Design a protein around this ligand. Sequence first.
Ligand SMILES: NS(=O)(=O)c1cccc(-c2nnn[nH]2)c1
Lengths: 271, 267
Amino acid sequence: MVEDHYEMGEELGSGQFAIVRKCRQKGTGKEYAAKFIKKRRLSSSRRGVSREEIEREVNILREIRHPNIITLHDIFENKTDVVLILELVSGGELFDFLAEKESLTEDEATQFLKQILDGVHYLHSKRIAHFDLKPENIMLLDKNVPNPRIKLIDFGIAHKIEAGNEFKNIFGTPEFVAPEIVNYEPLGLEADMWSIGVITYILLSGASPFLGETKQETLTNISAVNYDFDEEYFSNTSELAKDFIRRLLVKDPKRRMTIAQSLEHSWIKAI
Amino acid sequence: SMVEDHYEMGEELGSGQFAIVRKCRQKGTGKEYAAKFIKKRRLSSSRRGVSREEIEREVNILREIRHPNIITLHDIFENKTDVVLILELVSGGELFDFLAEKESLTEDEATQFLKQILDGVHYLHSKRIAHFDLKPENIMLLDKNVPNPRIKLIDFGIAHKIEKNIFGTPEFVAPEIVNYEPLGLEADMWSIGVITYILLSGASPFLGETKQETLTNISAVNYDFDEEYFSNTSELAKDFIRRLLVKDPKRRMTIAQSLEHSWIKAI
Ligand SMILES: NS(=O)(=O)c1cccc(-c2nnn[nH]2)c1
């Protein structure tokens, strides 16, 4: 029982069938975030989260030990919930911190981007695709210190990306498989690299590159790679910054820069 | 509970991915089952054992299913090293082996067995479960020594529940996600087409001399009905197969349509 081991406090937030509360561990006094994930009862139900999806997330969280990523401290389960005891991240969203400023220079921005890249480099080294990198999932540990530390959060749709042959072997031979299996192109780590390109674009310019009037229009823009570097937004942005973004916002995932290439890019190597 | 307190373990029946199957008997009823011992992956292990996620995925599917043409899960235990599934004992062997032993097999007899496969798949699809590994070796008989043997579909090791998807902002999502086309129930319908083609002819429609040829043949839907091998096969049967072996999953017969097709419905 979690309440026997942690003193539960205020609600901090809520997401997909989950409620996050602040807590404090009895005995140590250390503070954490307790994420209560509502379990799905019957497999036919669309409420809660299936046990297998909870496990997928927990298995990924268990592996993580990097300063730019949230960590898992403990786990409990009661009748209705799986309770993850996570690192407490209190500094808010990176972009909300940046909002307190009157302006932001390209060099100030790249300080933070390097941290995001370092976190993603760690994840990708373990074959973990986050799949929902966006500003809301880029938090700060503490926003009042001189050099705030980025924390990537929310592994709710993260997956480990198996080697390509691990898929094919499961069928024994291809004799009975359909064409959509033969031609199956799995989602991979490249998707996160795209997201990084979008994050960089907005971090530097304040503009969202693909946002349309409706979600459907945004999706059309993404699929067409319909963006530009208009001077109203990019007149104080370097050419190397634009090159970095261009090499990420590539439709073909196989032609996009990888995280290693991103870190070797001259724009990033310069600091 | 420990499994040994409830079941007498017997002889080894088979093996799976990090799994051993043993015959067993329930204490208190004397009824026989198959016990499948699946080795759990340790948190410090990379590749040994089966992941908890994959065990849970399959178990949650098995827990849901009850139908005469599908293997039944009777009990589950877990100890330090293994998850143990107590499954219905399916003893009659492969359908295709039983058929190969018949003096003669008529098209009408063939359709009656095919209809049982369709009944099982109709049930699975009604629960949004794609089997994804339908092939002769997963189509067994419960008991072969009866006048009309009952088909049992087995092996839910790669089966999945089937279901834009983005509840928050789409602004950061990659084009391959925006354009993602998940694998679906239609894949099982293709497999049924291939099974039917082999059932009637003994030939495989897409198999090539190498793996790449087989893959290429599937993708192009490059098959035909050889005059010799299909000389005793009705046009109505060929029509059934043609309406399943279709490249676009959206244009294949669904399970409901397959059961309504005159080849099945006429009998
Ligand atoms: N407290 S919160 O609203 O930012 C929130 C909501 C849902 C999930 C998380 C989370 N998941 N993994 N790490 N943090 C956080």
